[PDB]
Amino acid sequence: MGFLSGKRILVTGVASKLSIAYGIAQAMHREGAELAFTYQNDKLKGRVEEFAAQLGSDIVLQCDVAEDASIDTMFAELGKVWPKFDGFVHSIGFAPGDQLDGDYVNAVTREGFKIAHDISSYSFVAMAKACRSMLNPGSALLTLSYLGAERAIPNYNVMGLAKASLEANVRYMANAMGPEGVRVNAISAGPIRTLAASGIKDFRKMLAHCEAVTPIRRTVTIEDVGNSAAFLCSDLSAGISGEVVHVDGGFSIAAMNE
Amino acid sequence: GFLSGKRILVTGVASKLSIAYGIAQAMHREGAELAFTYQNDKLKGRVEEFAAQLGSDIVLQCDVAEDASIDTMFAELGKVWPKFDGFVHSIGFAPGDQLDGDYVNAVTREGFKIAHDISSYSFVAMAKACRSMLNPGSALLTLSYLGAERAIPNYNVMGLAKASLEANVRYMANAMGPEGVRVNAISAGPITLAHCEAVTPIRRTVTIEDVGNSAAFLCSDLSAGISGEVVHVDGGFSIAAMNE
Ligand SMILES: NC(=O)c1ccc[n+]([C@@H]2O[C@H](COP(=O)([O-])OP(=O)(O)OC[C@H]3O[C@@H](n4cnc5c(N)ncnc54)[C@H](O)[C@@H]3O)[C@@H](O)[C@H]2O)c1
Ligand SMILES: NC(=O)c1ccc[n+]([C@@H]2O[C@H](COP(=O)([O-])OP(=O)(O)OC[C@H]3O[C@@H](n4cnc5c(N)ncnc54)[C@H](O)[C@@H]3O)[C@@H](O)[C@H]2O)c1
Ligand SMILES: Cc1c(C2CN(C(=O)/C=C/c3cnc4[nH]c(=O)ccc4c3)C2)oc2ccccc12
Numbered sequence: 298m299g300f301l302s303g304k305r306i307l308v309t310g311v312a313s314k315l316s317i318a319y320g321i322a323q324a325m326h327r328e329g330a331e332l333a334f335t336y337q338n339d340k341l342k343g344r345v346e347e348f349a350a351q352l353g354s355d356i357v358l359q360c361d362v363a364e365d366a367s368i369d370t371m372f373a374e375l376g377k378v379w380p381k382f383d384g385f386v387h388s389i390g391f392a393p394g395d396q397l398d399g400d401y402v403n404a405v406t407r408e409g410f411k412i413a414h415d416i417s418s419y420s421f422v423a424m425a426k427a428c429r430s431m432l433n434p435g436s437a438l439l440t441l442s443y444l445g446a447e448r449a450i451p452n453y454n455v456m457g458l459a460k461a462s463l464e465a466n467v468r469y470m471a472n473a474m475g476p477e478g479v480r481v482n483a484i485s486a487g488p489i490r491t492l493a494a495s496g497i498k499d500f501r502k503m504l505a506h507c508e509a510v511t512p513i514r515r516t517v518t519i520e521d522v523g524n525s526a527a528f529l530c531s532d533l534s535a536g537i538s539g540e541v542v543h544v545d546g547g548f549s550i551a552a553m554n555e
Numbered sequence: 556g557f558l559s560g561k562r563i564l565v566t567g568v569a570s571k572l573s574i575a576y577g578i579a580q581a582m583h584r585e586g587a588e589l590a591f592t593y594q595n596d597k598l599k600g601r602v603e604e605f606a607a608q609l610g611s612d613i614v615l616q617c618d619v620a621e622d623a624s625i626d627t628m629f630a631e632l633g634k635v636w637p638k639f640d641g642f643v644h645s646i647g648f649a650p651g652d653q654l655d656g657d658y659v660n661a662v663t664r665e666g667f668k669i670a671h672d673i674s675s676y677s678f679v680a681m682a683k684a685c686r687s688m689l690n691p692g693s694a695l696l697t698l699s700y701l702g703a704e705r706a707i708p709n710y711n712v713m714g715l716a717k718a719s720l721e722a723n724v725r726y727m728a729n730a731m732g733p734e735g736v737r738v739n740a741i742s743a744g745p746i747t748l749a750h751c752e753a754v755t756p757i758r759r760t761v762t763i764e765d766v767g768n769s770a771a772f773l774c775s776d777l778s779a780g781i782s783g784e785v786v787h788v789d790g791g792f793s794i795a796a797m798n799e
């Protein structure tokens with residue numbers, strides 16, 4: 298048996314085969330995890346349904362985290378099979394295309410601010426509220442974050458005015474939920490390129506440097522991420538709640554090279 | 556007067572107890588030329604009254620909720636300070652509702668939006684609206700708390716906005732640096748507003764004067780080498796643990 302044997306985990310944000318959350322799933326299922334899957338809208342149903350086919354899970358349900366009701370009804374349907382389950386993965390994030398443009402001050406708008414903080418940050422706790430009662434004792438939550446949340450990176454702009462908002466969200470959550478036997482963590486992924494660079498400019502060159510400058514001299518993979526995520530979602534990490542773990546190959550710990 | 560020859564806009568004065576009041580008090584003390592904002596017909600009275608005390612009387616109606624109010628105040632200010640050297644962001648809100656008991660239970664969609672909207676977005680928003688009036692060696696400032704960095708019971712969604720705000724500060728500095736603008740936050744300790752003393756290194760809380768003279772400094776050219784920085788004016792409470 299692999300660990301997270303015995304566990305039921307819901308995994309959000311699975312757009313593709315190179316979708317990171319595809320990695321989180323892989324690692325988990327590879328370790329005998331029974332999963333469940335949400336898709337955003339009818340456009341992604343497909344499709345993700347098939348990926349869940351691959352990973353041996355029936356459960357396939359719409360969930361547009363913009364709407365409290367959609368999250369409610371999602372979980373309600375999920376309860377039909379999983380009266381209880383053991384945590385979910387939050388690999389959701391968005392900010393209107395225009396938002397991640399050039400100069401931050403220029404580009405950022407109240408609405409772009411609103412959406413980015415709603416979808417990449419609030420949504421995570423939104424889900425936690427709706428399924429709080431459905432969490433077994435010893436279940437864990439995870440969400441995915443970036444170094445933007447910690448530092449100013451061009452054309453990331455409002456994204457971590459969000460990821461920072463989301464980074465604290467982790468903490469307060471982990472704080473409110475421990476008493477009842479729940480751990481909230483987050484992985485600071487390096488890059489790692491998936492459907493997200495669909496608003497990120499300058500990307501082709503962006504990876505090489507920072508590959509020559511990462512302590513390990515390669516970018517981390519959806520496997521590398523999937524792998525720390527599965528551990529952070531398994532009982533092996535029983536003593537880790539409220540921590541923002543970096544999986545960037547050590548990128549954020551170097552400086553001035555070369 | 557190490558702040559002399561400078562024109563700074565202070566927001567968020569509402570009482571003698573206000574942080575912004577000590578900031579202004581401290582700022583005039585160092586010969587700064589000051590301007591103020593009110594947010595209510597309520598507040599207009601007191602703010603105007605303190606204006607006279609501090610020798611200035613640029614006093615304008617500004618509610619950071621409305622992108623429109625914002626630009627009109629800046630427009631009105633440009634008439635008297637066509638250009639100036641920065642502003643203090645002593646604002647924060649959560650319709651709370653929110654800062655009572657369990658975090659997850661308390662928090663709501665709207666509540667998350669409103670906190671973030673006023674406590675964090677406002678700060679950049681103003682910055683857009685006066686980009687153009689900012690003289691080189693300008694300084695923006697905002698008042699934060701430790702709840703950004705650590706989960707304080709009952710601070711709840713505010714923590715997340717300050718987190719977002721401090722993020723915001725780092726970005727703003729980075730965007731505005733090529734034009735001589737510095738941005739910083741004071742992570743102030745406990746003291747309008749809304750027993751660390753035993754655990755605090757200096758064995759007392761910071762005071763409006765403490766925070767005052769730091770703002771002053773951060774907004775003067777004496778703090779020339781500091782930008783995008785969250786200075787903990789909390790008496791070293793940030794950095795200690797388990798003091799019996
Ligand atoms: N290098 C990277 O790509 C990188 C690095 C660090 C963190 N992250 C984070 O990891 C997560 C996954 O992004 P990714 O780029 O790896 O894969 P991705 O870009 O395919 O993930 C995007 C997901 O956003 C979701 N989404 C957007 N709006 C939604 C809504 N209203 N309702 C429901 N779902 C919605 C979709 O379900 C989609 O699967 C994001 O939170 C992202 O910020 C990515
Ligand atoms: N004293 C403390 O408890 C403490 C400690 C650390 C940090 N802070 C921070 O300092 C800042 C100021 O708080 P304070 O303690 O000085 O008193 P306060 O919170 O009463 O003053 C805040 C001011 O915000 C203004 N305001 C509210 N909504 C507004 C809007 N929509 N548009 C424009 N202005 C608006 C009001 O005029 C008010 O005087 C806040 O950002 C707070 O988070 C306060
Ligand atoms: C790597 C890397 C990233 C990672 C982190 N991931 C994201 O947060 C993506 C966010 C995002 C946010 N909003 C978006 N909106 C869109 O319309 C299309 C794609 C889109 C992506 C991609 O962001 C960077 C910004 C600057 C430089 C490098 C990176």
Ligand SMILES: Cc1c(C2CN(C(=O)/C=C/c3cnc4[nH]c(=O)ccc4c3)C2)oc2ccccc12
Nearest residue numbers: 647648649650651700707708710713745748749
């Ligand atoms: C409080 C509060 C705020 C802002 C002002 N900020 C603060 O000054 C916060 C101070 C604070 C916040 N949390 C704290 N937590 C503690 O446990 C003990 C000290 C402590 C102090 C939060 O905006 C509001 C809007 C409506 C209603 C209440 C508030």
